[model samples]
Target chain A: DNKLFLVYVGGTAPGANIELHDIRFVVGPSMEETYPAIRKGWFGTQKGLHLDSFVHLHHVDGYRIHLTSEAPEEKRLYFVNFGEYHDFTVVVADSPQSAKQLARAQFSVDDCLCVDLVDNHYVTLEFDGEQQPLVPDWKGYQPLPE
Target chain B: DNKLFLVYVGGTAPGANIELHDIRFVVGPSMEETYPAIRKGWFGTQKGLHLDSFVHLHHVDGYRIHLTSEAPEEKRLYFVNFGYHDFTVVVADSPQSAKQLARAQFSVDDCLCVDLVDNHYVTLEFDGEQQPLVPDWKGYQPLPE
Candidate 1:
């Protein structure tokens, strides 16, 4: 791994108050669970009642050109949004610069300040305008306490 | 329950890159452990290898005067450290208790710095002269100017 964590900078939502969720369906001891650990638990926290964040599914490619590929290809999932509210489009393009091409043809020019990647992986949920720890559930993403 | 959650704002530690840990003992089917769940898990992450943060404990006061009361009293543990790098987690009801705890755990000048990881997150109420501690600052990404 090149050690690149996907970042979440909700331009309109602001970092300190944002909430991002990475939910997915997986087979394990808990058969009906669907989500990743580090990003999921924070959503259960109290900070995001008013802020903006994205909740998207974890990916697996159905075909070579599908949005999410198993291989770490150059193209990736970019949750793009431009409206005052969160209206996202999952763009599977190249760079942040190249990713905007899809947005111009997609998002209205008047609504977008700038459109780019909210990260196909993990976005940075800054702590009160600062970067908070992107922590995983130590107990292997187990269920929350009673 | 009052439903009042504690917040860790390490005023000096800076929120963005700070780290806070909450460790304690518990009795259950597991029977052999010491820690609360919500705050305990994050420390297991890769963040706080460097930056400043607090990691003191959960509560269960023994006597009326001992630090960390279950009664939800005004008094609480304040992990106070004035220098750089992490010192040691402290437990106290006031500055005097802090002094006593510090004096016991460390020999003066033997330490390079001192950071009392009070319930830094629950900076809730007990903490004074806090360092923000952010949530979990591990010294990775510097703030972008």
Candidate 2:
């Protein structure tokens, strides 16, 4: 059944005021056909934002290192499908030089950090947990073959 | 210039093992043309996950409240495209007052529980983090009061 939601399309990047974009109501099962975040260009989210506001994230007191990488000679793009709903997971892969190895013991990979990459190409993707339930927050994105 | 990256597309949901779907190396300037996450159906990310693992979240210790909202008489869909790359921001507001809006439809019982991952990532640094974040797009100039 369709319902009314208090949907606020905004960004909460710490000090910045909630960059509330589109705030309204609609009647739909999901926003895929309706309110989808901007996902385009090399950097999507910052296209409309003040240049000074978001660009400072990269130089976080030398916390982040940005380098231009030359495209590998044999680049491959893999598209993986998951779940009953057939959700898509497209990937651009590099060799195993930097891929962290996951130990058999789950405790070893306990400490990990998730960095954000926001440009104008933003996609606030949260699927409907109807037939399938939402996964717990403890799961890690350990590089895998499955 | 496209370069190689050690991109790990996994989840950071706190307790469970990393749901590492597909991890490998590829050369690209961005993941848009190459690697895009699953964005489909009413619930996209939790489909393949174990039913028991995720279903337990909804019946929390009286933390969340789920409801089925009836579609109002006049329901309108807003297609909000932002940025130079043209991203989408769709909103489903029913009544006139909407600041106090933001709920889930369909079968979403676990509102408090976060079914998150290494998704919703955003970084603004490449042009030396020195470029002025200005808006060249002209569509938004008139909306200013």
Candidate 3:
């Protein structure tokens, strides 16, 4: 099995405006706060790092986020198998067409946007373009257990 | 740079049919030698009695067959660090779609059939119609040495 390792630190401050509104809360967000986006200068034990061109995401209201790759092209699948975490998932498309298609479908507001959240924290939510900045201010979030 | 190991033994064969023919000749002409399609197997390895998914292949037209997991989806790429005489040019797509497109393109060609070649001289082609019988073929085809 091909596994990826991902570990991100930080949180988005709601209201950070950017393109791809539904998925843009991460635009100006700190790379550190970016969920699963990976942190630089911090090398742990994660392996098999891959990022999808377009990510299909599942989020916990205020906690964690799960993402899946939807690319069809073999090359679109980037990978690394040695790090602190087991692996990290990034969105990918087989081709430009597939990438566009996957992006459209996943961001369509119904397909990948739906999630089952227990504390309403695990559920994924889309950003409304009308909102100025879409950053989520994470006042209290736990770090990877030491 | 991250690196892994791959060993390509035996020689290349001519045409995808050669693999089917060879299997048939050895297993028995009517013994279902020609696989329904691409066949696959897996194993692992360690210093003491290793196991792996590697396969064996023989030469036909100066080309040796190889069994590998260096597919796009399998993100890990491999290379021949040392010994081996046979040669091959392997290509992979950068975007996952390109990889599928390439595979699809090869599916239509007789020379592009995906097969598993072993160092021992056996060939196993993949059957597109069924679920992948083997584990994921991961990694990039390493540069020739």
Candidate 4:
């Protein structure tokens, strides 16, 4: 069973907000399950993260805050620092099991949780002052080619 | 010479600029000379207070950062509670013998160091919160009026 982790960072406008929905994770070959308890307050709430304020979410060794806003609109990015939390999302798989016909997928690289309603949007990843190739994962999700 | 002390608090709009040419302080007979100096550096040179980002002036006790800005247009107020050497103006004087008769003369206060521009306005006072009545020798000087 591969477990997926989600994180976010950046500032939002006065009335705009974000809500994560339709979360799915792979279980077995054909078992895809949507996370339980999608309603607000499903996972206890914390006041430090205000409903109307800038929030910085980064990657930690073993700790992470579980958060999903109830608001509809997505938030805008102000500035993100690699030091604190670069506002990234990740998923880890337990074991690698594939049949003879298993298709090769891009699984080595980390994915950024982002959705840009506007065009010409980009996300830059930095490590040790060196920038990595720009990756654009619209709305933090990608669909298999038709 | 008599000297006046004053303070202001609030936020300024990005790129908004203002000058302190109309502040008038009504002085009274009591002081012999007065000189204005900001908390950061010496005064004189038409030095204006500018809050590029933010500023906060501390109290006499040095424990709490008080002084606030007053917005005349919006009638709203904002707090500038933190900054490096933000509140740096202080005008002091011992009224000169001849000027003693003037009663009131306008002198710059601590808040004038930062160039307060447009989009933000702060309150100014001569005697500060104590509001001690000015004597007859000190004259009043108006900044914008």
Model no. 4, DockQ? 0.03
Q: Which stretches of candidate 1 lie over 4 Å from their true place?
A: A1-32, A35-74, A81-86, A109-146, B1-145
Candidate 2: tens digits of C-alpha lDDT, residues A1-146: 22222222322222111132222222233333223322211121332322111111112211222222121222222222222111222222232221122211212322221222222121122223223121221221121111
Task: Choose the strongest candidate by lDDT.
Answer: 1
User: Which stretches in model 4 have alpha-carbon errors above 4 Å?
Assistant: A1-136, A139-146, B1-74, B78-145
* TM-score for chain B of all predictions: 0.30, 0.19, 0.17, 0.17
Scored by Cα lDDT, where does model 1 land? 0.29
Give the Å error, residue B14, model 3.
Answer: 38
TM-score of each: 0.23, 0.19, 0.21, 0.17
| lDDT (C-alpha) at residue B2 in model 2 | 37
Model 3 lDDT, residue B101, Cα: 39
Q: What tens-digit string does per-residue lDDT give for candidate 1 at B1-145? A: 1111122221111212112222221222221121132223222233222222222233312211122223233444444432223333354556666656666754511111111122221223332344322233232221111
Q: Give the TM-score of candidate 1.
A: 0.23
Alpha-carbon local distance difference test for all models: 0.29, 0.22, 0.23, 0.22
Task: Write the number of the candidate with greater TM-score, choosing between 1 and 3.
Answer: 1
* DockQ in order: 0.02, 0.02, 0.01, 0.03
The CA lDDT at B57 in model 3 is 25
Better of 1 and 2 by TM-score: 1
lDDT of 4 by residue, A1-146 (tens): 22222222111112111111122111111112211211221121221221211122222213232222221322222211110212222212212222111212322311122321211222222223322221222232222211
